[PDB]
Enzyme design. Structure first.
Site, PDB file in Angstrom:
ATOM      1  N   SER A 209      -1.326 -29.658 -45.234  1.00 43.39           N
ATOM      2  CA  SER A 209      -0.083 -30.039 -44.586  1.00 43.39           C
ATOM      3  C   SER A 209       0.821 -30.838 -45.545  1.00 43.39           C
ATOM      4  O   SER A 209       1.304 -30.281 -46.537  1.00 43.39           O
ATOM      5  CB  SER A 209      -0.345 -30.757 -43.253  1.00 43.39           C
ATOM      6  N   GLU A 341       0.139 -23.298 -36.292  1.00 40.21           N
ATOM      7  CA  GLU A 341       0.539 -24.571 -36.894  1.00 40.21           C
ATOM      8  C   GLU A 341       1.459 -25.439 -36.028  1.00 40.21           C
ATOM      9  O   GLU A 341       1.380 -26.660 -36.076  1.00 40.21           O
ATOM     10  CB  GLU A 341       1.308 -24.328 -38.204  1.00 40.21           C
ATOM     11  N   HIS A 449      -2.873 -26.999 -36.481  1.00 36.01           N
ATOM     12  CA  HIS A 449      -2.820 -27.645 -37.782  1.00 36.01           C
ATOM     13  C   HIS A 449      -3.932 -28.659 -38.015  1.00 36.01           C
ATOM     14  O   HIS A 449      -4.373 -29.364 -37.090  1.00 36.01           O
ATOM     15  CB  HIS A 449      -1.466 -28.303 -38.007  1.00 36.01           C
TER      16      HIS A 449
HETATM   17  S1  LIG Z   1       1.149 -32.172 -41.687  1.00 37.44           S
HETATM   18  O1  LIG Z   1       1.044 -33.295 -42.550  1.00 37.44           O
HETATM   19  O2  LIG Z   1       0.311 -32.137 -40.541  1.00 37.44           O
HETATM   20  C1  LIG Z   1       2.859 -31.904 -41.153  1.00 37.44           C
HETATM   21  C2  LIG Z   1       3.866 -31.906 -42.291  1.00 37.44           C
HETATM   22  C3  LIG Z   1       5.267 -31.799 -41.714  1.00 37.44           C
HETATM   23  C4  LIG Z   1       6.240 -31.270 -42.714  1.00 37.44           C
HETATM   24  C5  LIG Z   1       7.597 -31.135 -42.093  1.00 37.44           C
HETATM   25  C6  LIG Z   1       8.606 -30.707 -43.112  1.00 37.44           C
HETATM   26  C7  LIG Z   1       9.941 -30.499 -42.456  1.00 37.44           C
HETATM   27  C8  LIG Z   1       9.926 -29.327 -41.512  1.00 37.44           C
HETATM   28  C9  LIG Z   1      11.341 -29.021 -41.078  1.00 37.44           C
HETATM   29  C10 LIG Z   1      11.394 -27.826 -40.159  1.00 37.44           C
HETATM   30  C11 LIG Z   1      11.053 -28.202 -38.752  1.00 37.44           C
HETATM   31  C12 LIG Z   1      12.237 -28.959 -38.170  1.00 37.44           C
HETATM   32  S1  LIG Z   2      -1.573 -33.461 -37.069  1.00 39.30           S
HETATM   33  O1  LIG Z   2      -1.078 -34.008 -35.876  1.00 39.30           O
HETATM   34  O2  LIG Z   2      -1.230 -34.119 -38.275  1.00 39.30           O
HETATM   35  C1  LIG Z   2      -3.358 -33.097 -36.997  1.00 39.30           C
HETATM   36  C2  LIG Z   2      -3.804 -33.560 -35.643  1.00 39.30           C
HETATM   37  C3  LIG Z   2      -5.213 -33.123 -35.265  1.00 39.30           C
HETATM   38  C4  LIG Z   2      -5.569 -33.783 -33.932  1.00 39.30           C
HETATM   39  C5  LIG Z   2      -6.492 -32.939 -33.089  1.00 39.30           C
HETATM   40  C6  LIG Z   2      -6.375 -33.309 -31.616  1.00 39.30           C
HETATM   41  C7  LIG Z   2      -7.208 -32.354 -30.786  1.00 39.30           C
HETATM   42  C8  LIG Z   2      -7.312 -32.782 -29.331  1.00 39.30           C
HETATM   43  C9  LIG Z   2      -8.420 -32.005 -28.618  1.00 39.30           C
HETATM   44  C10 LIG Z   2      -9.791 -32.241 -29.269  1.00 39.30           C
HETATM   45  C11 LIG Z   2     -10.897 -31.454 -28.575  1.00 39.30           C
HETATM   46  C12 LIG Z   2     -12.224 -31.767 -29.227  1.00 39.30           C
END
Ligand SMILES: *S(=O)(=O)CCCCCCCCCCCC
Ligand SMILES: *S(=O)(=O)CCCCCCCCCCCC
Ligand SMILES: *[C@@H]1O[C@H](CO)[C@@H](O[C@@H]2O[C@H](CO)[C@@H](O)[C@H](O)[C@H]2NC(C)=O)[C@H](O)[C@H]1NC(C)=O
Ligand SMILES: *[C@@H]1O[C@H](CO)[C@@H](O)[C@H](O)[C@H]1NC(C)=O
Ligand SMILES: [Ca+2]
Ligand SMILES: [Ca+2]
Length: 534
Positions: A209, A341, A449
Site C-alpha cells: 500500500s 482494494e 487491502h
Molecule cells: S494503504 O497504505 O493501505 C492506502 C494508501 C492510500 C494511497 C492513496 C493515494 C491517493 C489516492 C487518490 C485517489 C482516491 C481519491
Molecule cells: S488499511 O485500513 O490500511 C488495512 C486494514 C486491515 C484491517 C482489517 C479489518 C478486518 C475486520 C474483520 C476481521 C475479521 C477477522
C-alpha cells in the site's frame, strides 16, 4: 551475543532469537525534533560502540485515522484508545523515531553476501511502524528454500510530521520528508549491511500500500538516478498494492489548504512565518492539531491530507508523466494487487446513498474533473450493485446502493488500474504481476487491502507461496520462477498481449489469468490522469 562492527568501527550487539538474529532500534539519523521538524533527515552522528540493539524503538507520531476537523464518535473513540496509557505502553511513538532494524538467519557472518530485502511499511502515509511486521516467517522460509535473505526495515515519518506540504515547505526545499527518511535508510544499508552479512549490491525494496507507492516514488526519484557513491541503491522492487501516487505538486491547492488548516489548529494562524511557528509548538499541540485534520478513514477517505507530492526537485513532475517520459530506474519488478482494494475505504462514505450524492462526493474528491469527466466515470462505474466491489458478488454486500460503486472507483484509481498504467508504459526491466482473490466470499470486504500482510508475516496460506516463496526467489535470482512453484509465472509485457499475463491466487492455490478487466474504467480514469489527482 550476535555482533556487528559498523562502517565507522562501532561494534554493536544484537539479540539471539534462536530462529534468527536481530539488531533492532539502530538510529540512522539525528532526531527530527525542534527546529529539525519537517526538514530532511540528518545523518546520524554519534557512537553506537558497545551498544545493545535488542528491541524496536518507538514508531514516529501517528495520526488518528478517524481524525478530522469535525467532531464525531469514531474520532473520539480512537483518540480515547490512542492516548490510553496502556496503548502508549504496548505501542510507543515519538518524534525521535528514525531507527533501522536488521534481522538475519542464525549463523550469519560479515561477508556472507546474502541478498537483502528492505521493507517499507504501509498505513496511508499517516500511521505505521516497523514493529508490526515480523520478518521471522519470511526469514525461516528463505532458509528452508536454500535461499536465505536478510530482512531490513526502516522507520519513516508519517502524517504532518513527514508529509507536510504547501508554499512554505516548497520554498524551503522540505517536501516529502518521510520519503527522504526511507532514502537515508537505503544509504545506511549500502554503507553498513556488509557487516551484518548482506550484499549491498543485492538489495530488493518492497512495501505494501503506502509502502508500495513509496517504492514507486523511489524508482522515480531523481528522474531515475538511484545511485549512491556510483552504485544503485537497489536491484529490484516488489510492489504490493500501489503504483504511482495521483497527486498535485507540493504547493498545489490541497497541499496548501491542509497546511493552513493545521497552522490554524496549532494556533499559528496569525504568524507571519507559519512554518517557524509550527516548529515551536509542543509535540502535544502538534499532535492535537494534526488529529484535527482529516485522517484516511474519515469522510475525505483517500483524498489524503498527507502523501507524496511532486516537488520539482526529487520528484520532478506528475508521476504518471515521469512514467510516460521514461524517467525511472531500469530494474526488474513485481507489482500486484488484492482483488477488492477499495472496500475497506468505501466504508467511510456510507451516508452517500443516491446517485446524486455519489456525483457530489466524486466532485468533492476530484476537484480537477469536469462534469463530462464525472459523467464518464459514472457510466464506466455504474450504480448497478452487481458491478461493484467486492467483485462478482451479485446482489450481496449492498450496505447502500452506492457502496460497491464507490469501492470500485477508489480501488481502481488508487491501486489496480494504476498498476496497469505503469505496466503498459514501463520498459525499464522485466515485469511480473499478480492479482489475489484469496479471500473471495469474505462478506463486505472480499480480498481487501493489506490481507497479504497476514499471509506474509503472520499466517500460512495459499498466498504465502507468492508473498514469501516467490518474493524470496525474485530477491535472490531476479526471477520468481526459481521458487519452483507448480504454476509458471508469465512475464507481463502489456495488457493487450495475447495469453495470460497475471499470476492469480485463490483459496486453493495459484493459476494464471488476463489483466483485461474494466477497460472502460481504465480509460475513464486515465485518458487524462491529472483530472483525477488530489
Ligand atoms: S494503504 O497504505 O493501505 C492506502 C494508501 C492510500 C494511497 C492513496 C493515494 C491517493 C489516492 C487518490 C485517489 C482516491 C481519491
Ligand atoms: S488499511 O485500513 O490500511 C488495512 C486494514 C486491515 C484491517 C482489517 C479489518 C478486518 C475486520 C474483520 C476481521 C475479521 C477477522
Ligand atoms: C456525509 O457526512 C460528511 C461528514 O460529516 C458530511 O460532510 C460534512 O458536512 C458538514 C456540513 O455540511 C461540513 O461542514 C463538513 O465540512 C463536511 N465534512 C467534510 C469532511 O467534507 C457530508 O455532507 C455527508 N454527506 C451526505 C451525502 O449527507
Ligand atoms: C534532491 O535533489 C537535489 C537536486 O537534484 C539533490 O542535490 C539531492 O541530492 C536530492 N535528494 C535526495 C535525498 O536524493
Ligand atoms: Ca497559505
Ligand atoms: Ca530512462
Amino acid at each position: 551475543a550476535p555482533t556487528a562492527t559498523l562502517a565507522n568501527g562501532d561494534t554493536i550487539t544484537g539479540l539471539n532469537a534462536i530462529i534468527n538474529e536481530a539488531f533492532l532500534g539502530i538510529p540512522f539519523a539525528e532526531p527530527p525534533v525542534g527546529n529539525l521538524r519537517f526538514k530532511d533527515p540528518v545523518p546520524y552522528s554519534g557512537s553506537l560502540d558497545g551498544q545493545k540493539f535488542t528491541s524496536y524503538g518507538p514508531s514516529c507520531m501517528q495520526q488518528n485515522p478517524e481524525g478530522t476537523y469535525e467532531e464525531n464518535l469514531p474520532k473520539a473513540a480512537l483518540d480515547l484508545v490512542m492516548q490510553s496509557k496502556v496503548f502508549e505502553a504496548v505501542s510507543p511513538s515519538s518524534e525521535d523515531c528514525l531507527t533501522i532494524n536488521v534481522v538475519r538467519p542464525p549463523g550469519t557472518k560479515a561477508g556472507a553476501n546474502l541478498p537483502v530485502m528492505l521493507w517499507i511499511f504501509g498505513g496511508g502515509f499517516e500511521v505505521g511502524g516497523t514493529s508490526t511486521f515480523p520478518p521471522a516467517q519470511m526469514i525461516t522460509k528463505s532458509i528452508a528454500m536454500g535461499k536465505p535473505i536478510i530482512h531490513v526495515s526502516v522507520n519513516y515519518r508519517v502524517s504532518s510530521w513527514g508529509f507536510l506540504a504547501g508554499d512554505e515547505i516548497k520554498a524551503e526545499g522540505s517536501a516529502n520528508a518521510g520519503l527522504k527518511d526511507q532514502r537515508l535508510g537505503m544509504q545506511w544499508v549500502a554503507d553498513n549491511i556488509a557487516a551484518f552479512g548482506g550484499d549491498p549490491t543485492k538489495v530488493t525494496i518492497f512495501g505494501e500500500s503506502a509502502g508500495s507507492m513509496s517504492v514507486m516514488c523511489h524508482i522515480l526519484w531523481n528522474d531515475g538516478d538511484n545511485t549512491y557513491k556510483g552504485k544503485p541503491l537497489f536491484r529490484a522492487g516488489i510492489m504490493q498494492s500501489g503504483a504511482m501516487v495521483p497527486s498535485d505538486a507540493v504547493d498545489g491547492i490541497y497541499g496548501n489548504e491542509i497546511f493552513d488548516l493545521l497552522a490554524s489548529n496549532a494556533g499559528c494562524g496569525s504568524a507571519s512565518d507559519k512554518l517557524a511557528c509550527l516548529r515551536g509548538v509542543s509535540s502535544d499541540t502538534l499532535e492535537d492539531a494534526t488529529n484535527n485534520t482529516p485522517g484516511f478513514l474519515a469522510y475525505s477517505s483517500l483524498r489524503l491530507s498527507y502523501l507524496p507530492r511532486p516537488d520539482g526537485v526529487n520528484i520532478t513532475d506528475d508521476m504518471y508523466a515521469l512514467v510516460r517520459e521514461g524517467k525511472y530506474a531500469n530494474i526488474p519488478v513485481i507489482i500486484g494487487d488484492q482483488n477488492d482494494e477499495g472496500t475497506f475505504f468505501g466504508t467511510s462514505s456510507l451516508n452517500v446513498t443516491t446517485d446524486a450524492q455519489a456525483r457530489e462526493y466524486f466532485k468533492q474528491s476530484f476537484v480537477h474533473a469536469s462534469d463530462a469527466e464525472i459523467d464518464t466515470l459514472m457510466t464506466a462505474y455504474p450504480g448497478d450493485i452487481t458491478q461493484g466491489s467486492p467483485f462478482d458478488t451479485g446482489i450481496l454486500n449492498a450496505l447502500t446502493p452506492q457502496f460497491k460503486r464507490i469501492s470500485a472507483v477508489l480501488g481502481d484509481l488508487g491501486f489496480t488500474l494504476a498498476r496497469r498504467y505503469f505496466l503498459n508504459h514501463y520498459t525499464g526491466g522485466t515485469k511480473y504481476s499478480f492479482l489475489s482473490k484469496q479471500l473471495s466470499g469474505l462478506p463486505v470486504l472480499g480480498t481487501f487491502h493489506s490481507n497479504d500482510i497476514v499471509f506474509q508475516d503472520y499466517l500460512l496460506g495459499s498466498g504465502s507461496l507468492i508473498y514469501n516463496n516467490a518474493f524470496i526467489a525474485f530477491a535472490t535470482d531476479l526471477d520468481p520462477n526459481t521458487a519452483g512453484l507448480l504454476v509458471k509465472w508469465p512475464e507481463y509485457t502489456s495488457s493487450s498481449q495475447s495469453g495470460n499475463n497475471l499470476m492469480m491466487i485463490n483459496a486453493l492455490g495459484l493459476y494464471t489469468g488476463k489483466d483485461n478487466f474494466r477497460t472502460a474504467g481504465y480509460d475513464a480514469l486515465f485518458s487524462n490522469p491529472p483530472s483525477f489527482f488530489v
